[PDB]
């Protein structure tokens, strides 16, 4: 009936800023380790174990009882939502029958030694949703999760490395974990998930421990790991994952074609003709030529490539990734105050044959600010202006297409202000527009979409 997780959630609900809520939750998640130390020294560098000495730390987040209800009461399907997995004679198996995952089938698979893995806990649990929704905002990257329930005296999964940064939250039971440093320079901070490996492929664990509820284990993408249940208890854990393809190279990959195209438009040296006879000394077949034109051809490539830095539209690419992030984001979890100050908390409802509370409008005296800090991004595309937002996203990844609205040039400045000054209230009448019309329409359009709050409710009971 109380736990550290329940308390931190009540605490978040009293922190007015969403940026601050996010920092605070991530502090809680790794406590007592300071985030700053973690991000400077451990993130993308080391495996980290936090021995919580508190079995209750995560109570309320997710439980096996939760899972059992969901199988009974929601349309959970094998494959789409739930996997049944075994690791037995050095071999990974998958035992999903097609269709609905009823309790009766799931528990018989469990009983036969299958781990159960729920791929999108956040679609079924409001607590996991809140957890990830808050944390994504301090990662600048989608936070996902899987829940892994493993039966006693069994291993569910082969040793492997994944393509994300992983935080394992031990929820119930005990599990023996082995985590290994990247085996080779090329596996450090891996881009893609590895194949299932065998024990002959493994070196010596850098971390070997039995996790217990409340504990945390973190390790970077590329760190092999495996896990088992011994000693007759089950294990349940939730892995929080982030930073899938959020690298410097992924930034460049988008930058380069634009930069070359810009370089070709703006500087004739990029438009000059290749030599008529480069095919005489370049190519695989010419890889050992002593033609000095070869040497010079290479140098020129490197000099031209170097000069691309100048043409790279860094801010434009930053906004495209921002926009992708907006699309990938879980929709926001509103504090009671945020609800109460927004369109969502308006007391307008139907009672005895009619709607009550109609019509309390925004005026120039209404003081406003963005609903939260991590729900919206203004992006210029095709010489138009588009405000992308998260407030209508599904809890399921990309179930809805990207949502946006156009912001007319007259209104652009006022929108930039709004986004850049959260959480400071601004009189609608002091927003930088020419008219009172434009002030009022931006504010009102933002409000009705659930993007804006008012210092006081517009409508009272």
């Amino acid at each position: 009936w109380d736990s550290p997780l329940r308390r931190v959630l009540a605490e978040l609900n009293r922190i007015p800023s969403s940026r601050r809520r996010a920092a605070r939750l991530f502090e809680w998640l790794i406590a007592p380790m300071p985030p700053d130390h973690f991000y400077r020294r451990l993130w993308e560098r080391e495996a980290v174990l936090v021995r919580r000495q508190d079995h209750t730390y995560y109570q309320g987040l997710f439980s096996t009882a939760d899972l059992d209800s969901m199988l009974r009461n929601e349309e959970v399907q094998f494959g789409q939502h739930l996997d049944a997995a075994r690791y037995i004679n050095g071999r990974r198996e998958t035992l999903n029958p097609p269709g609905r995952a009823l309790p009766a089938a799931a528990w018989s698979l469990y009983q036969a030694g299958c781990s159960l893995r729920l791929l999108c806990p956040q679609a079924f649990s409001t607590t996991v949703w809140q957890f990830l929704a808050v944390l994504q905002e301090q990662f600048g990257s989608m936070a996902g999760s899987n829940v892994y329930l493993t039966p006693p005296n069994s291993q569910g999964f082969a040793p492997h490395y994944d393509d994300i940064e992983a935080f394992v939250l031990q929820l119930e039971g005990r599990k023996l974990w082995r985590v290994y440093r990247p085996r080779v320079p090329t596996e450090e901070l891996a881009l893609t998930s590895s194949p299932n490996f065998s024990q002959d492929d493994l070196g010596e664990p850098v971390l070997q421990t039995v996790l217990e509820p409340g504990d945390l284990l973190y390790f970077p993408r590329g760190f092999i790991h495996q896990a088992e249940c011994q000693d007759g208890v089950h294990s349940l854990h939730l892995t929080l994952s982030t930073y899938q393809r959020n690298t410097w190279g992924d930034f460049l990959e988008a930058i380069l074609p634009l930069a070359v195209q810009a370089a070709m438009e703006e500087n004739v040296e990029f438009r000059r003709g290749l030599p008529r006879d480069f095919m005489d000394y370049m190519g695989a077949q010419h890889s050992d030529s002593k033609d000095p034109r070869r040497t010079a051809f290479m140098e020129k490539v490197r000099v031209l490539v170097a000069r691309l830095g100048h043409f790279a539209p860094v801010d434009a690419v930053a906004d495209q990734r921002a926009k992708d992030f907006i699309h990938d984001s879980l929709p926001p979890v509103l504090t009671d105050r945020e609800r109460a100050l927004s369109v969502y908390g308006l007391p307008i409802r139907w009672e005895a044959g009619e709607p009550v509370n109609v019509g309390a409008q925004l005026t120039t005296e209404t003081e406003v600010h963005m609903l939260q800090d991590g729900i919206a991004r203004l992006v210029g595309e095709g010489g138009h202006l588009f405000l992308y937002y998260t407030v209508e996203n599904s809890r399921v990844y990309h179930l809805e297409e990207p949502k946006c609205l156009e912001i007319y040039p007259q209104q652009a400045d006022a929108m930039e202000l709004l986004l850049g000054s959260y959480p400071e209230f601004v009189r609608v009448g002091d927003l930088p527009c020419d008219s009172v019309e434009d002030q009022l329409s931006l504010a009102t359009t933002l409000y009705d979409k659930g993007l804006l709050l008012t210092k006081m409710p517009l409508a009272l009971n």
Binding site: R91, R92, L119, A158, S241
Partner: peptide, 11 residues
Amino acid sequence: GGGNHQHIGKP
């Protein structure tokens, strides 16, 4: 048998 952590919550 196949896949390990599915970050996006889909196969």
